[PDB]
mmCIF file with all atom_site columns, C-alpha atoms in Angstrom:
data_model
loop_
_atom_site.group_PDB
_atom_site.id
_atom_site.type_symbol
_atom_site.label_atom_id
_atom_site.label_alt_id
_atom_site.label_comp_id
_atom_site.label_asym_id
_atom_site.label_entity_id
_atom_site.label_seq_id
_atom_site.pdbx_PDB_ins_code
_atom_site.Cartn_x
_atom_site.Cartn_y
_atom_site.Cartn_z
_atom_site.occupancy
_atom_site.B_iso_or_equiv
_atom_site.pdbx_formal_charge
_atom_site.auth_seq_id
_atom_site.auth_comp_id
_atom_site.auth_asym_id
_atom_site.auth_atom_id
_atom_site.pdbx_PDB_model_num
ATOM 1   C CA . UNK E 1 1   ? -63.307 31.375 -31.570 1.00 17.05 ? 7   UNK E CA 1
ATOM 2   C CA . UNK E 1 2   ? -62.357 30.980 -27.818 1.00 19.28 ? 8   UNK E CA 1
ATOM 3   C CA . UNK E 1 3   ? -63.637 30.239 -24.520 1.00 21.23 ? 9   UNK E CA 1
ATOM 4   C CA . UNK E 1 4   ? -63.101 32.592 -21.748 1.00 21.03 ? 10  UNK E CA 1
ATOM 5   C CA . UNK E 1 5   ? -64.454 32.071 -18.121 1.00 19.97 ? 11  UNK E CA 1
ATOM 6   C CA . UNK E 1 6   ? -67.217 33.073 -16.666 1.00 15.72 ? 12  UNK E CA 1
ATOM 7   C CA . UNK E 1 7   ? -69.083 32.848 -12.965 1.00 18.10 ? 13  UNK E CA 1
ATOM 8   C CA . UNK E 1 8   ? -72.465 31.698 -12.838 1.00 17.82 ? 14  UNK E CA 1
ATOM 9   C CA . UNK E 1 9   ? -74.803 33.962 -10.990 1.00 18.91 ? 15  UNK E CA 1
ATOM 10  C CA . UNK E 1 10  ? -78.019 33.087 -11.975 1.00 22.57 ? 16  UNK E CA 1
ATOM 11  C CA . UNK E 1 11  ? -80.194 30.153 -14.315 1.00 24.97 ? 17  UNK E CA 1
ATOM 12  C CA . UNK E 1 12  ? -82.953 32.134 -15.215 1.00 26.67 ? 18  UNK E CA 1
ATOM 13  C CA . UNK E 1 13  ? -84.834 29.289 -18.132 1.00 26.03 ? 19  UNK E CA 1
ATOM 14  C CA . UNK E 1 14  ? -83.654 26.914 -20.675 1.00 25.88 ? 20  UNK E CA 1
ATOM 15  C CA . UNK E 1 15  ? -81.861 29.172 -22.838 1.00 24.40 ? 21  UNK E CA 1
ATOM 16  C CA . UNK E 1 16  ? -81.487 32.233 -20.612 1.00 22.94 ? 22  UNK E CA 1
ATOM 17  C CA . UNK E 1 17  ? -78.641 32.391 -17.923 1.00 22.74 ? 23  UNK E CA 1
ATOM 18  C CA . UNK E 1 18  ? -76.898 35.141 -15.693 1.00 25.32 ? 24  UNK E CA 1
ATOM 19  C CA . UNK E 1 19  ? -73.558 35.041 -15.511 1.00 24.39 ? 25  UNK E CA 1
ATOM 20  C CA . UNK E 1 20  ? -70.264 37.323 -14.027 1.00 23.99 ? 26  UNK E CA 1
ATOM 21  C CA . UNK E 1 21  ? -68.540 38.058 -17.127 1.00 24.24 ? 27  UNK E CA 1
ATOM 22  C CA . UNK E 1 22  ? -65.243 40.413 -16.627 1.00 28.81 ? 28  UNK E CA 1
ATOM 23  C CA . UNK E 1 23  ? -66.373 41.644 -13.618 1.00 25.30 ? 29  UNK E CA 1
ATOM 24  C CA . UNK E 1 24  ? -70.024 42.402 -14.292 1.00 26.21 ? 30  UNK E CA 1
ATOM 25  C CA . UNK E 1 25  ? -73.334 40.944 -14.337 1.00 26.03 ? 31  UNK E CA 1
ATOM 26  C CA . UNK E 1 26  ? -74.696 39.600 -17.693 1.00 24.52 ? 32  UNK E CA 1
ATOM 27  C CA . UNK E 1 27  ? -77.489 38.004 -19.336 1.00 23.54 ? 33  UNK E CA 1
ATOM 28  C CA . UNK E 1 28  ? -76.670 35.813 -22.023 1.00 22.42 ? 34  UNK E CA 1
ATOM 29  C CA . UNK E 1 29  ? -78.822 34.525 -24.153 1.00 20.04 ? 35  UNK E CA 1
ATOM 30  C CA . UNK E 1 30  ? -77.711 30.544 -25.569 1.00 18.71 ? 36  UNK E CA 1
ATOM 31  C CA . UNK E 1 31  ? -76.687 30.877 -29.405 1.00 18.44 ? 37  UNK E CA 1
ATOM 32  C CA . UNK E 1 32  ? -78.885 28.862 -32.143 1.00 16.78 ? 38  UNK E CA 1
ATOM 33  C CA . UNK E 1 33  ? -81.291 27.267 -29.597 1.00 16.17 ? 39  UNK E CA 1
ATOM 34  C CA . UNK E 1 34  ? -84.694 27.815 -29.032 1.00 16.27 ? 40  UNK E CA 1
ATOM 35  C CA . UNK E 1 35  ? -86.282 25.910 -26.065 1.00 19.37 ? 41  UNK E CA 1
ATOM 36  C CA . UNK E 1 36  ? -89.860 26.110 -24.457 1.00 19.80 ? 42  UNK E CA 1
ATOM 37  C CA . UNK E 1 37  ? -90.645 29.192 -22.401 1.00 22.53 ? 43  UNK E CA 1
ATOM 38  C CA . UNK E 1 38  ? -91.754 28.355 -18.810 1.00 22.70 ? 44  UNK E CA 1
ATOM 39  C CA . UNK E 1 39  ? -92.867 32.746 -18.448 1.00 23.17 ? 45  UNK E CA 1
ATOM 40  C CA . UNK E 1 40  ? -94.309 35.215 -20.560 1.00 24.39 ? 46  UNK E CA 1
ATOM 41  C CA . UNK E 1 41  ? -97.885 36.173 -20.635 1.00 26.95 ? 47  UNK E CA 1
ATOM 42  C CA . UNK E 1 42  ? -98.649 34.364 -24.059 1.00 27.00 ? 48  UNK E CA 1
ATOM 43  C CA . UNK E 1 43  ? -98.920 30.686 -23.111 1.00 24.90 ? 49  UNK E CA 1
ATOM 44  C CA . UNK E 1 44  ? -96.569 30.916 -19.698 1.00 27.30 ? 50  UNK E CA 1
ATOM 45  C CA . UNK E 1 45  ? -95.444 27.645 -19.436 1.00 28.99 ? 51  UNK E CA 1
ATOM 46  C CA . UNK E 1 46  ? -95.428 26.084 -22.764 1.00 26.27 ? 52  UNK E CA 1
ATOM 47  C CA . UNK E 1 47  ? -94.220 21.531 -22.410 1.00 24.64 ? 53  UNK E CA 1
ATOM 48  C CA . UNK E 1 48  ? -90.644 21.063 -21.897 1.00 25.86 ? 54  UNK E CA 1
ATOM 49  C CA . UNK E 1 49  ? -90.454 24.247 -20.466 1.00 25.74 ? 55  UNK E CA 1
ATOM 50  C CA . UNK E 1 50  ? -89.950 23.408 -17.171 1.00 26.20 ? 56  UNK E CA 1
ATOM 51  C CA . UNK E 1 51  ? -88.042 20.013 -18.400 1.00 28.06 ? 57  UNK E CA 1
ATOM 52  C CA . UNK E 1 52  ? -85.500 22.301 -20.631 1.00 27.19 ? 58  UNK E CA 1
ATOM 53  C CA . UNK E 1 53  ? -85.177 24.950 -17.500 1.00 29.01 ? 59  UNK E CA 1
ATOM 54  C CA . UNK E 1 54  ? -84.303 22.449 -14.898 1.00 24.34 ? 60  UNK E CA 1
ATOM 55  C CA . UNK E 1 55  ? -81.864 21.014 -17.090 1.00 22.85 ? 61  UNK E CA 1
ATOM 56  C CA . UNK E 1 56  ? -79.718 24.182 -18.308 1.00 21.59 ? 62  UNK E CA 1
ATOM 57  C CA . UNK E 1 57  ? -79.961 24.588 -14.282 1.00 20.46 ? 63  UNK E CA 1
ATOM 58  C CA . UNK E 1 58  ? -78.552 21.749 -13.049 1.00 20.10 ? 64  UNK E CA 1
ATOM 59  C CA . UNK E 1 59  ? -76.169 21.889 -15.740 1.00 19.11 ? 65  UNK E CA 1
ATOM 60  C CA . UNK E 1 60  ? -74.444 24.538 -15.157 1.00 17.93 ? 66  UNK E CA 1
ATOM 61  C CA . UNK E 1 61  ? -74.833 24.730 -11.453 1.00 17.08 ? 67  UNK E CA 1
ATOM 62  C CA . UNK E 1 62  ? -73.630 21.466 -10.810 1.00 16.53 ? 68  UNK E CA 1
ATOM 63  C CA . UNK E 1 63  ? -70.232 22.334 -12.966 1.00 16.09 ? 69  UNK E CA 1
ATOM 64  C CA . UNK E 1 64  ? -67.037 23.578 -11.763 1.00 16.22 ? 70  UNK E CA 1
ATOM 65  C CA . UNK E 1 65  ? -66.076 25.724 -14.884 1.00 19.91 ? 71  UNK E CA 1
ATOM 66  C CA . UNK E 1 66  ? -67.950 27.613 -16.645 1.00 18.03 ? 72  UNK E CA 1
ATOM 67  C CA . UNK E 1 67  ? -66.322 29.284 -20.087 1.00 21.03 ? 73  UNK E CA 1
ATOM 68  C CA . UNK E 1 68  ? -68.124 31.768 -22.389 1.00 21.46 ? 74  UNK E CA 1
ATOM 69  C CA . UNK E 1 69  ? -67.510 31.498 -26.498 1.00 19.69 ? 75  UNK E CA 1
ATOM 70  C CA . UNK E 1 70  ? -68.447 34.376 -28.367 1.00 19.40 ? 76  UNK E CA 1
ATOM 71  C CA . UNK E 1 71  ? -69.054 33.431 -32.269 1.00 21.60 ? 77  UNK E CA 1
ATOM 72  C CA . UNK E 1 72  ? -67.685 36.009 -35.278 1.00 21.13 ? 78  UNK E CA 1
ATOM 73  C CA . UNK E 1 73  ? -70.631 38.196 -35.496 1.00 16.51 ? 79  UNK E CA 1
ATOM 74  C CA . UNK E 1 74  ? -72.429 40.508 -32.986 1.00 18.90 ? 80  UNK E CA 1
ATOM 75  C CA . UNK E 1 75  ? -71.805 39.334 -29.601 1.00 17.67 ? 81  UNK E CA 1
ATOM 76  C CA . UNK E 1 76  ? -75.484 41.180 -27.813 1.00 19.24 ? 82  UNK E CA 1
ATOM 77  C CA . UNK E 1 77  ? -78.866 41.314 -28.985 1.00 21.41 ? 83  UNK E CA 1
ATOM 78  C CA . UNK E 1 78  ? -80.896 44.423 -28.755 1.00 19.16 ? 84  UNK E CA 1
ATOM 79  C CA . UNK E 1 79  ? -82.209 43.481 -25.246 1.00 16.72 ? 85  UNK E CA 1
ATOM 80  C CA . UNK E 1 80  ? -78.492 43.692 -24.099 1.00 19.20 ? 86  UNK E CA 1
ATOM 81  C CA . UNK E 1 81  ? -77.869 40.211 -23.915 1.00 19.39 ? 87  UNK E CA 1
ATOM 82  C CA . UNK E 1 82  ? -74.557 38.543 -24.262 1.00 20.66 ? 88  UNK E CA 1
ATOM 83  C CA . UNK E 1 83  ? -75.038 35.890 -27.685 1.00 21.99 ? 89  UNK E CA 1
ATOM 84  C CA . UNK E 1 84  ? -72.859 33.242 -26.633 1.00 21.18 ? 90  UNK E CA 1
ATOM 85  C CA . UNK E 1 85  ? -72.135 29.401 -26.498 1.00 26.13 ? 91  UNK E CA 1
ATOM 86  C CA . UNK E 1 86  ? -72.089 28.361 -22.949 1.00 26.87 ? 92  UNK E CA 1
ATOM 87  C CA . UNK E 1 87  ? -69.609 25.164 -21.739 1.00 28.07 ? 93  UNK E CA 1
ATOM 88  C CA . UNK E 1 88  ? -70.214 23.899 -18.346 1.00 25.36 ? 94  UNK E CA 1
ATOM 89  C CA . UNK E 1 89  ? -67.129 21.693 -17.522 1.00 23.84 ? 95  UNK E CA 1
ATOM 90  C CA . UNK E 1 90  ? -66.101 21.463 -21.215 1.00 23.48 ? 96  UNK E CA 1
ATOM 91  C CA . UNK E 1 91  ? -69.618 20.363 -22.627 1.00 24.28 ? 97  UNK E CA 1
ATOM 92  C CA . UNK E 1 92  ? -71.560 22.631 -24.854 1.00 22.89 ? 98  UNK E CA 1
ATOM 93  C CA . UNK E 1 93  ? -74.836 23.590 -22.863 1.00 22.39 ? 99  UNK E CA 1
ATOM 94  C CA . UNK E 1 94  ? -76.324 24.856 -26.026 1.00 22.18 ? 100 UNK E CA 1
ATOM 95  C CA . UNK E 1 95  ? -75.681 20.963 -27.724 1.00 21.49 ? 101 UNK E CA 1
ATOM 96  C CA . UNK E 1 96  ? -76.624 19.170 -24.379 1.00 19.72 ? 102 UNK E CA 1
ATOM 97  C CA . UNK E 1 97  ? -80.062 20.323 -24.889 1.00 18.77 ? 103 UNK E CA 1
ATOM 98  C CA . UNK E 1 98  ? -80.799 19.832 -28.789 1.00 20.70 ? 104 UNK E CA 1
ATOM 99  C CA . UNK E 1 99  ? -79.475 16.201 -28.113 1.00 19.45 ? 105 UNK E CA 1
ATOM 100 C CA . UNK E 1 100 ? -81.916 15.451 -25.637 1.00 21.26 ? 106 UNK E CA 1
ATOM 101 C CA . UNK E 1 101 ? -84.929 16.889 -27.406 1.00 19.05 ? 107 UNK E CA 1
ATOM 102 C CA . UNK E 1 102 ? -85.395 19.910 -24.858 1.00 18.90 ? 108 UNK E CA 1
ATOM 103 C CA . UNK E 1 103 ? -84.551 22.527 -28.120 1.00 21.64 ? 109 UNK E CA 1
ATOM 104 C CA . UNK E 1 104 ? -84.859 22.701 -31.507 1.00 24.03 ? 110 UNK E CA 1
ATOM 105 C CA . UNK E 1 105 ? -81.920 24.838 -33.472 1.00 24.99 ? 111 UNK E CA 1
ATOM 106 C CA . UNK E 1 106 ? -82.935 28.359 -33.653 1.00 23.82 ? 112 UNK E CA 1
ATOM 107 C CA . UNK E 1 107 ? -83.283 30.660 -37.024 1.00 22.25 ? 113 UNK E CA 1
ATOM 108 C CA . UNK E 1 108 ? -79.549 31.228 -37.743 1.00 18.21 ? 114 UNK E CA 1
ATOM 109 C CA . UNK E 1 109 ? -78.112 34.902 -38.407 1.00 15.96 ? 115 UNK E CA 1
ATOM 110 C CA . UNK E 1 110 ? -74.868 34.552 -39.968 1.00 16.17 ? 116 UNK E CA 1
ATOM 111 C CA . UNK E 1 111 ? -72.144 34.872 -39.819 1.00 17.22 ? 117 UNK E CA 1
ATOM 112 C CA . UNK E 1 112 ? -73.426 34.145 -36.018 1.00 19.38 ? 118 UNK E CA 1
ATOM 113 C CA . UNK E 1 113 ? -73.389 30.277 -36.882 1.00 17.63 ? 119 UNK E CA 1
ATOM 114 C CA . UNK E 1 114 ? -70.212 28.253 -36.659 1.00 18.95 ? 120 UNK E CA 1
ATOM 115 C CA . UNK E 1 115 ? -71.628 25.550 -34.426 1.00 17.92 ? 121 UNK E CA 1
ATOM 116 C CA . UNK E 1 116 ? -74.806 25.053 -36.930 1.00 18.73 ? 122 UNK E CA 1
ATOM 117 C CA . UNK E 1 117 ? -74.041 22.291 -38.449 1.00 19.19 ? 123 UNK E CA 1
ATOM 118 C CA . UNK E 1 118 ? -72.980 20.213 -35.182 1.00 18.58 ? 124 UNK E CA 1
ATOM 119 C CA . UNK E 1 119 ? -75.959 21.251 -33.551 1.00 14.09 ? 125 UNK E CA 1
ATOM 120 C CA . UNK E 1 120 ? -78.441 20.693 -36.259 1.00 14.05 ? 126 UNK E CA 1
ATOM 121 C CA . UNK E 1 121 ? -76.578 17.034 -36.422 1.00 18.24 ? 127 UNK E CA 1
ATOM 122 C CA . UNK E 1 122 ? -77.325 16.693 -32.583 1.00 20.87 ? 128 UNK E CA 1
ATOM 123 C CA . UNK E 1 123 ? -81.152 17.606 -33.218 1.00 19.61 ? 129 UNK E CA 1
ATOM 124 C CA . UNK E 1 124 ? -81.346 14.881 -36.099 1.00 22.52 ? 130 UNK E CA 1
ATOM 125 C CA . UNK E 1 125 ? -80.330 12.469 -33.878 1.00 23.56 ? 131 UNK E CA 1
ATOM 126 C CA . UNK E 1 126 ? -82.389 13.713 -30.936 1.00 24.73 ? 132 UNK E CA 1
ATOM 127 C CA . UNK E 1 127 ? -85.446 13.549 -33.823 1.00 21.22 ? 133 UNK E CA 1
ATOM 128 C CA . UNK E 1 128 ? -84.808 9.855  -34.937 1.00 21.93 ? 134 UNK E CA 1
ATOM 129 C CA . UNK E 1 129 ? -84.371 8.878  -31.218 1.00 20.97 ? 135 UNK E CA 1
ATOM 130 C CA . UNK E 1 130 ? -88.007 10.797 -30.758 1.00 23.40 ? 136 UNK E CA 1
ATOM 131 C CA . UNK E 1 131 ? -86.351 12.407 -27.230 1.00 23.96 ? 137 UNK E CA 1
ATOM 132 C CA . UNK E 1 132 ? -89.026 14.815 -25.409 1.00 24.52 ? 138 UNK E CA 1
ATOM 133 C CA . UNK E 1 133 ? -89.758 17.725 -28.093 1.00 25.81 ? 139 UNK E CA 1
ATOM 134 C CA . UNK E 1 134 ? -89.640 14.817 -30.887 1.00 25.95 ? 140 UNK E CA 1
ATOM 135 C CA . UNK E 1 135 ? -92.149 12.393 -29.438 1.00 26.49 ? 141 UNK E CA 1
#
């Protein structure tokens, strides 16, 4: 794998961002994370949604780089969204938020899955600290 930069355009929720990517806009969609949603219809604004939002936001606005990493496998979704692991001044978004509690790790698709086994070693600590989702 490899990083490659990226401009941020937009934070749209925890694990949902905009970004300038080669020139055009893109969603992309954080690899292996699920956090809580803070729209759609079903419950709207289910807890830690706003918590896990704000944070991917200030995250990555407050950086100064931003760098992309595709994993092995397919690199969109069917919605059209970029699958990616996102680094906001050299710091994994996508782990920043399992260690706090504000995401559990996703259902994993390989071979889309390199980073599993650091992230799911993130959320067991996040879980034995009982951090936000775990308490």
């Amino acid at each position: 794998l490899h990083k490659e930069p990226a401009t941020l355009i937009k934070a749209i929720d925890g694990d949902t961002v905009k970004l300038m990517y080669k020139g055009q806009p893109m969603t992309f969609r954080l690899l292996l994370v699920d956090t809580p949603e803070v729209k759609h219809p079903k419950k709207g604004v289910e807890k830690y949604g706003p918590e896990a939002s704000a944070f991917t936001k200030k995250m990555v606005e407050n950086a100064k780089k931003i760098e992309v990493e595709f994993d092995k496998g397919q690199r969109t979704d069917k919605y059209g969204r970029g699958l990616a692991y996102i680094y906001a001044d050299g710091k994994m978004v996508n782990e920043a938020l399992v260690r706090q509690g504000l995401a559990k790790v996703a259902y994993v698709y390989k071979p889309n899955n390199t980073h599993e086994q650091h992230l799911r070693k993130s959320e067991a600590q996040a879980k034995k600290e009982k951090l936000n989702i775990w308490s």
